[PDB]
Design a protein around this nucleic acid. Structure first.
Length: 73
DNA sequence: GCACAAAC
DNA sequence: GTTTGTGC
Protein backbone atom coordinates (compact mmCIF):
# COMPACT_ATOMS: atom_id res chain seq x y z
CA UNK A 1 0.00 0.00 0.00
CA UNK A 2 1.86 3.10 1.22
CA UNK A 3 5.53 3.23 0.36
CA UNK A 4 7.93 4.66 2.96
CA UNK A 5 8.94 8.33 2.48
CA UNK A 6 11.84 10.17 4.22
CA UNK A 7 11.40 13.72 5.50
CA UNK A 8 10.34 16.18 2.77
CA UNK A 9 12.78 19.00 1.91
CA UNK A 10 10.05 21.13 3.52
CA UNK A 11 9.86 19.37 6.90
CA UNK A 12 13.71 19.33 6.80
CA UNK A 13 13.58 23.09 7.51
CA UNK A 14 11.09 22.36 10.30
CA UNK A 15 13.65 20.08 11.98
CA UNK A 16 16.54 22.64 12.24
CA UNK A 17 14.87 25.94 11.16
CA UNK A 18 12.13 25.53 13.71
CA UNK A 19 14.65 24.77 16.44
CA UNK A 20 15.70 28.40 15.93
CA UNK A 21 12.11 29.62 16.45
CA UNK A 22 11.91 27.43 19.57
CA UNK A 23 14.97 29.13 21.16
CA UNK A 24 13.80 32.77 21.17
CA UNK A 25 10.09 31.87 20.83
CA UNK A 26 9.45 28.49 22.53
CA UNK A 27 5.90 29.81 23.32
CA UNK A 28 4.04 30.54 20.07
CA UNK A 29 0.35 31.13 20.83
CA UNK A 30 -1.17 30.51 17.42
CA UNK A 31 0.24 28.74 14.37
CA UNK A 32 2.37 31.74 13.31
CA UNK A 33 5.58 29.77 12.74
CA UNK A 34 3.47 28.34 9.89
CA UNK A 35 2.59 31.49 7.90
CA UNK A 36 6.01 32.87 8.85
CA UNK A 37 7.92 30.14 7.01
CA UNK A 38 5.75 30.98 4.00
CA UNK A 39 7.46 34.40 4.03
CA UNK A 40 10.88 32.68 4.01
CA UNK A 41 9.79 30.71 0.92
CA UNK A 42 9.20 33.90 -1.09
CA UNK A 43 12.79 34.71 0.05
CA UNK A 44 14.68 31.43 0.60
CA UNK A 45 17.90 31.98 2.59
CA UNK A 46 20.85 30.48 0.63
CA UNK A 47 22.59 29.89 3.98
CA UNK A 48 20.03 27.11 4.57
CA UNK A 49 19.57 25.84 0.97
CA UNK A 50 22.99 24.64 -0.26
CA UNK A 51 23.87 22.88 3.08
CA UNK A 52 21.04 20.26 3.38
CA UNK A 53 19.88 20.24 -0.31
CA UNK A 54 22.95 18.22 -1.37
CA UNK A 55 21.92 15.39 0.99
CA UNK A 56 18.16 15.63 0.27
CA UNK A 57 19.11 14.94 -3.37
CA UNK A 58 20.31 11.34 -2.86
CA UNK A 59 17.64 10.50 -0.18
CA UNK A 60 14.99 10.91 -2.87
CA UNK A 61 17.14 9.30 -5.62
CA UNK A 62 17.56 5.99 -3.71
CA UNK A 63 14.00 5.32 -2.53
CA UNK A 64 12.73 6.74 -5.84
CA UNK A 65 14.68 4.20 -7.87
CA UNK A 66 13.10 1.43 -5.75
CA UNK A 67 9.51 2.49 -6.67
CA UNK A 68 9.64 3.80 -10.28
CA UNK A 69 6.07 2.99 -11.46
CA UNK A 70 4.58 2.56 -7.96
CA UNK A 71 2.45 5.71 -7.39
CA UNK A 72 0.12 7.02 -4.70
CA UNK A 73 -3.41 5.57 -4.76
C1' DG B 1 -6.97 17.13 -6.40
C1' DC B 2 -5.60 12.97 -3.67
C1' DA B 3 -1.78 10.25 0.05
C1' DC B 4 2.08 10.65 3.48
C1' DA B 5 5.28 12.86 7.09
C1' DA B 6 7.09 16.27 11.85
C1' DA B 7 6.62 19.64 15.26
C1' DC B 8 4.96 23.89 17.75
C1' DG C 1 -5.37 24.62 14.20
C1' DT C 2 -2.14 24.89 9.93
C1' DT C 3 1.82 24.85 6.61
C1' DT C 4 4.56 22.75 2.42
C1' DG C 5 7.11 19.31 -1.27
C1' DT C 6 6.88 15.27 -4.32
C1' DG C 7 4.33 12.28 -8.44
C1' DC C 8 0.65 11.81 -12.51
Amino acid sequence: DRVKRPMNAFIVWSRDQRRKMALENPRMRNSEISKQLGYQWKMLTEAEKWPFFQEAQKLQAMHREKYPNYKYR
